[PDB]
Amino acid sequence: DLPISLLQTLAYKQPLGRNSRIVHFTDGALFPVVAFGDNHSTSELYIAVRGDHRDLMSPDVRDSYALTGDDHKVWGATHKFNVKTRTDLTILPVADVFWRADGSADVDVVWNDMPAVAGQSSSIALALASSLPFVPKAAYTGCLSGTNVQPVQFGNLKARAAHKIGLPLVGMTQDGGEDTRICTLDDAADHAFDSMES
């Protein structure tokens, strides 16, 4: 059958991030990462960057990867993805992000002791990160079907992670939690470039 929409109260904490290093990225895309235990739920940003930045991961996540739809690796992510990236990517938890004047950013990369990231709501970030020469000021969420976005659960808790550092949640969620709704990959790259203005 199809879903029942139900309301659920969640106890949310922010990840304590550890082993903090400011690194300068000329490119990468942000996306939200949610997890649930007995007790508490978490919402955080991670940054997807093209190439292998394994050196920047915790050891406890370094060996984990998912395949992209053209057989590349996304280091830090768990099972193929729909998305075709023509590059490996690595995703990293981040506590904050300081843009420079040129579209680049100093990104506080952290260790959170979370497991490898499951699910495909990162697909929009993957895409932009595999193609853009700048760090869009926004976080992205949405699974991909070809170039059509599909809506993800947890929009509202996802938006928390973005708003915590002054960024919109952009993409598509089942609960309308995004600040701006974007149904295609073209519109998300349009939005990413727009995000760079003032």
mmCIF file of N, CA, C and O in Angstrom, residues 10 15 21 27 33 40 49 61 73 79 85 87 89 92 99 105 115 124 142 157 166 170 172-174 177 181 187 191:
data_model
loop_
_atom_site.group_PDB
_atom_site.id
_atom_site.type_symbol
_atom_site.label_atom_id
_atom_site.label_comp_id
_atom_site.label_asym_id
_atom_site.label_seq_id
_atom_site.Cartn_x
_atom_site.Cartn_y
_atom_site.Cartn_z
ATOM 1 N N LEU A 10 10.646 13.971 18.191
ATOM 2 C CA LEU A 10 12.031 13.440 18.025
ATOM 3 C C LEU A 10 12.810 14.212 19.087
ATOM 4 O O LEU A 10 12.507 15.392 19.315
ATOM 5 N N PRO A 15 25.610 16.592 16.900
ATOM 6 C CA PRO A 15 26.824 15.875 17.053
ATOM 7 C C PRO A 15 27.895 16.740 17.756
ATOM 8 O O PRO A 15 28.091 17.914 17.424
ATOM 9 N N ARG A 21 39.906 20.150 12.013
ATOM 10 C CA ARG A 21 40.826 20.906 11.140
ATOM 11 C C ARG A 21 40.164 21.798 10.097
ATOM 12 O O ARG A 21 39.321 21.353 9.319
ATOM 13 N N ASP A 27 36.091 23.588 -3.851
ATOM 14 C CA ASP A 27 34.913 22.917 -4.399
ATOM 15 C C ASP A 27 34.375 21.844 -3.470
ATOM 16 O O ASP A 27 35.118 21.329 -2.726
ATOM 17 N N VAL A 33 22.772 15.045 7.022
ATOM 18 C CA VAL A 33 22.893 13.660 7.419
ATOM 19 C C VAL A 33 22.178 13.418 8.758
ATOM 20 O O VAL A 33 22.541 14.028 9.794
ATOM 21 N N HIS A 40 18.152 9.543 21.408
ATOM 22 C CA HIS A 40 18.280 10.738 20.542
ATOM 23 C C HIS A 40 18.465 10.499 18.996
ATOM 24 O O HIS A 40 18.903 9.468 18.554
ATOM 25 N N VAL A 49 33.151 16.016 -1.551
ATOM 26 C CA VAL A 49 34.263 16.661 -2.429
ATOM 27 C C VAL A 49 34.706 15.636 -3.393
ATOM 28 O O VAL A 49 34.857 14.457 -3.053
ATOM 29 N N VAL A 61 35.805 5.045 9.294
ATOM 30 C CA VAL A 61 34.954 5.108 8.063
ATOM 31 C C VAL A 61 35.626 4.999 6.683
ATOM 32 O O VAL A 61 34.974 4.701 5.668
ATOM 33 N N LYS A 73 33.667 5.450 -6.859
ATOM 34 C CA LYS A 73 33.478 5.376 -5.368
ATOM 35 C C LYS A 73 33.170 6.669 -4.661
ATOM 36 O O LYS A 73 33.692 7.778 -4.984
ATOM 37 N N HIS A 79 26.228 1.210 0.862
ATOM 38 C CA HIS A 79 25.117 0.524 0.165
ATOM 39 C C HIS A 79 24.172 -0.193 1.178
ATOM 40 O O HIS A 79 23.107 -0.720 0.804
ATOM 41 N N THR A 85 28.744 10.258 -11.735
ATOM 42 C CA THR A 85 29.574 11.357 -11.331
ATOM 43 C C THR A 85 30.836 11.521 -12.183
ATOM 44 O O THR A 85 31.395 12.553 -12.064
ATOM 45 N N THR A 87 33.694 10.626 -11.382
ATOM 46 C CA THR A 87 34.793 10.812 -10.457
ATOM 47 C C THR A 87 34.464 10.082 -9.136
ATOM 48 O O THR A 87 33.293 9.898 -8.749
ATOM 49 N N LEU A 89 34.377 10.320 -5.031
ATOM 50 C CA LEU A 89 34.149 11.492 -4.184
ATOM 51 C C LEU A 89 34.373 10.934 -2.812
ATOM 52 O O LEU A 89 34.392 9.704 -2.662
ATOM 53 N N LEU A 92 32.583 14.000 4.131
ATOM 54 C CA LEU A 92 33.234 14.306 5.411
ATOM 55 C C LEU A 92 32.282 15.058 6.323
ATOM 56 O O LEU A 92 31.598 16.032 5.860
ATOM 57 N N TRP A 99 33.189 30.946 3.929
ATOM 58 C CA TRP A 99 33.488 31.349 2.537
ATOM 59 C C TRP A 99 34.512 32.489 2.469
ATOM 60 O O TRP A 99 34.597 33.387 3.374
ATOM 61 N N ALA A 105 36.032 27.996 0.200
ATOM 62 C CA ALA A 105 35.693 28.052 1.654
ATOM 63 C C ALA A 105 36.639 27.261 2.535
ATOM 64 O O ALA A 105 37.188 26.227 2.143
ATOM 65 N N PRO A 115 28.533 6.020 11.999
ATOM 66 C CA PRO A 115 28.890 5.047 10.956
ATOM 67 C C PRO A 115 28.908 5.668 9.567
ATOM 68 O O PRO A 115 28.561 6.834 9.403
ATOM 69 N N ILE A 124 22.018 14.816 -4.908
ATOM 70 C CA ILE A 124 22.150 16.112 -5.422
ATOM 71 C C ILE A 124 23.536 16.708 -5.088
ATOM 72 O O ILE A 124 24.179 17.183 -5.991
ATOM 73 N N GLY A 142 18.182 15.215 -1.617
ATOM 74 C CA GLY A 142 17.327 14.732 -2.603
ATOM 75 C C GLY A 142 17.953 13.530 -3.253
ATOM 76 O O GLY A 142 19.141 13.552 -3.535
ATOM 77 N N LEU A 157 14.094 17.952 10.240
ATOM 78 C CA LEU A 157 15.285 17.725 10.988
ATOM 79 C C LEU A 157 16.583 18.031 10.169
ATOM 80 O O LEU A 157 17.601 18.481 10.759
ATOM 81 N N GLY A 166 23.390 28.977 9.288
ATOM 82 C CA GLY A 166 22.960 30.117 8.371
ATOM 83 C C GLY A 166 22.714 29.804 6.864
ATOM 84 O O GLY A 166 22.566 30.697 6.094
ATOM 85 N N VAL A 170 17.958 23.065 0.488
ATOM 86 C CA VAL A 170 17.499 23.161 -0.840
ATOM 87 C C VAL A 170 17.303 21.750 -1.380
ATOM 88 O O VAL A 170 18.123 20.811 -1.168
ATOM 89 N N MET A 172 14.296 18.475 -2.126
ATOM 90 C CA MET A 172 12.908 18.040 -2.068
ATOM 91 C C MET A 172 12.767 17.059 -0.909
ATOM 92 O O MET A 172 13.561 16.088 -0.817
ATOM 93 N N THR A 173 11.783 17.339 -0.030
ATOM 94 C CA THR A 173 11.487 16.503 1.108
ATOM 95 C C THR A 173 9.996 16.159 1.168
ATOM 96 O O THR A 173 9.202 16.908 0.593
ATOM 97 N N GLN A 174 9.670 14.990 1.728
ATOM 98 C CA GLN A 174 8.265 14.641 1.986
ATOM 99 C C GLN A 174 7.525 15.623 2.917
ATOM 100 O O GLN A 174 6.373 15.848 2.696
ATOM 101 N N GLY A 177 10.165 20.419 4.347
ATOM 102 C CA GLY A 177 11.121 21.090 5.270
ATOM 103 C C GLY A 177 12.155 21.981 4.588
ATOM 104 O O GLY A 177 12.820 22.806 5.248
ATOM 105 N N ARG A 181 12.418 24.658 -2.936
ATOM 106 C CA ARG A 181 12.161 23.349 -3.531
ATOM 107 C C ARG A 181 12.691 23.231 -4.936
ATOM 108 O O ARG A 181 12.380 24.069 -5.752
ATOM 109 N N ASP A 187 18.174 22.790 -12.107
ATOM 110 C CA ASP A 187 17.726 23.843 -11.212
ATOM 111 C C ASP A 187 18.550 23.911 -9.974
ATOM 112 O O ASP A 187 18.843 24.960 -9.501
ATOM 113 N N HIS A 191 20.603 27.049 -8.853
ATOM 114 C CA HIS A 191 20.468 27.579 -7.560
ATOM 115 C C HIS A 191 21.878 27.749 -6.918
ATOM 116 O O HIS A 191 22.167 28.708 -6.251
#
